[PDB]
């Protein structure tokens, strides 16, 4: 089998157990759903999900081996309610009967898997992500949690890699067949919430191979993703992020048609607990179609216009049609049907691994075969001979074209972009 005993998934504006065992799922009015299989646990009282497992079929009494897998997205701390953020722990999923079973909790930047046997004995294992990174790859972004249990070790894997281990030999009989309650439960703030996707309970200790494969499979999509992990949308407003220059951002140079590269403003307050680089900075960009359009979701290989808002107007990102050197500065300008420029971009995901990055390829014709260059950041000449001075600019380069063909794909490339929309899970 798939060794699966619970499989919540989405159907007809509801959640449902598709494991094949027909558990009874009850979703109250406080839980928000979407067709992309996500659901949101809020602070309000009626924001819970009760699952009544099937007591009438299999051996619903205890498990020596079992795993729990799901995707999650956890909002960033409030810049003032930091003390509350660190101090208060709260339960999100609870499965107890007769004061025994498992529960999953969150204390600030730490996520916790706790076991309790019938004797009252308790044991925990957790995962903590740094809250001082200039760019955090876990905060407010979707990642993949898997928790494997036998009778020796409780393990926590994040995105396919083992991240934590705990000895549970002292741990004895655990009661599994209790009601499963998805609810924010603790000393939380009014503005507290959690996003979850693809919840599944297995009756086996999944191997690292099985877990990594499950991660790759559930991570796959025909469409592209933004900075947080959600689908990448046409006609939506975005900031831009360079995977190779984490601390940099684009700004239209004063009295100029080119793109300057400046440094991200950081957390400038006097907490000695946290640190981040501002994300809602730089020119506000926006993706447009180029014409079977359907939904406003940006898919791979689609042809697009990269526009952005300057003052009170939508401008476009062009390139000069024939430039001599390896690379050339990009030409930002009002929207025109011009002769000297290409305006059409083909959006690619050259990476074979689960990533949130995409790349921008300039082509001659959408029917053609010749490739101009990729979009990135380059260091151009600027000043005098006495003292060499160079400057980072919003560029198009032919150099990336051969680099993308290198395997395994280099994540730190400058042709790798990620789009950052305003999200209620990120304040600054």
């Amino acid at each position, epitope marked *: 089998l798939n060794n699966i005993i619970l499989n919540l998934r989405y159907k007809d504006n509801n959640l449902i157990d598709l494991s094949g065992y027909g558990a009874k799922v009850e979703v109250y009015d406080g839980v928000e759903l979407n067709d992309k299989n996500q659901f949101k646990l809020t602070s309000s009282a009626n924001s819970k999900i009760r699952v009544t497992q099937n007591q009438n079929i299999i051996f619903n009494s205890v498990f020596l081996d079992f795993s729990v897998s799901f995707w999650i997205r956890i909002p960033k701390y409030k810049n003032d309610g930091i003390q509350n953020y660190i101090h208060n722990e709260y339960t999100i999923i609870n499965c107890m009967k007769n004061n025994s079973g498992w529960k999953i909790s969150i204390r600030g930047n730490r996520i916790i898997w706790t076991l309790i046997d019938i004797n009252g004995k308790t044991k925990s294992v957790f995962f903590e992500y740094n809250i001082r990174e200039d760019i955090s790859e876990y905060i407010n972004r979707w990642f993949f949690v898997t928790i494997t249990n036998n009778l020796n070790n409780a393990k926590i894997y994040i995105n396919g890699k083992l991240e934590s281990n705990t000895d549970i030999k002292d741990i004895r009989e655990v009661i599994a067949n209790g009601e499963i309650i998805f609810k924010l439960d603790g000393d939380i703030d009014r503005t507290q919430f959690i996003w979850m996707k693809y919840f599944s309970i297995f009756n086996t200790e999944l191997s690292q191979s099985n877990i990594e494969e499950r991660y790759k499979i559930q991570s796959y999509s025909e469409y592209l993703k933004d900075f947080w992990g959600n689908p990448l949308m046409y006609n939506k407003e975005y900031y831009m992020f360079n995977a190779g220059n984490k601390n940099s951002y684009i700004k239209l140079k004063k*009295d*100029s*048609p*080119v793109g300057e590269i400046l440094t991200r403003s950081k957390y400038n307050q006097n907490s000695k607990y946290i640190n981040y680089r501002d994300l809602y900075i730089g020119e506000k960009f926006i993706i447009r179609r180029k014409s079977s359009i359907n939904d406003d979701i940006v898919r791979k290989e689609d042809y697009i216009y990269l526009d952005f808002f300057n003052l009170n107007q939508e401008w476009r990102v062009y390139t*000069y049609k*024939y*430039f*001599k*050197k390896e690379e*050339e*500065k990009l*030409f930002l300008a009002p929207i025109s049907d011009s*002769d*000297e420029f290409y305006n059409t971009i083909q959006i690619k995901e050259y990476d074979e691994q689960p990533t949130y990055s995409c790349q921008l390829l300039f082509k001659k014709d959408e029917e053609s075969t010749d490739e101009i260059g990729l979009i990135g950041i380059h260091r*151009f*000449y*600027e*000043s*005098g*001979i006495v003292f060499e001075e160079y400057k980072d600019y919003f560029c198009i380069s032919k150099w990336y074209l051969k680099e993308v063909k290198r395997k395994p794909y280099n994540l730190k490339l400058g042709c790798n972009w990620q789009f950052i929309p305003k999200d209620e899970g990120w304040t600054e």
Partner: nanobody
Amino acid sequence: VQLAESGGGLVQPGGSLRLSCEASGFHLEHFAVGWFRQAPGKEREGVSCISASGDSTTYADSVKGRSTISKDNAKNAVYLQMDSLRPEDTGDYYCAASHFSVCGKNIRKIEYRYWGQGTPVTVSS
């Protein structure tokens, strides 16, 4: 980082004149370069421009046949030869450097970053 500007002033309708500029400040190899004329009662207009190398230069239609333009990477300088002058080509003349190497078909003041300070030419009776 400024641009020196040379070339004479007063000439008679039909003559010729050479205007030059020295790159005292930055190196000049990798930047396209342009010339702009501004007559009294008008806004600055492009006359001619050259690629960062020598791939090809573009001219305004009126002087199209008349003027020719050159660039020296050794002397770090750029020159504009204007022949058979008209009594209309009179005004202040300026030079500038582009952000890009390519010299586009049409000439936009937006692309050019340095300027200063201006050498005047006059064509009249």
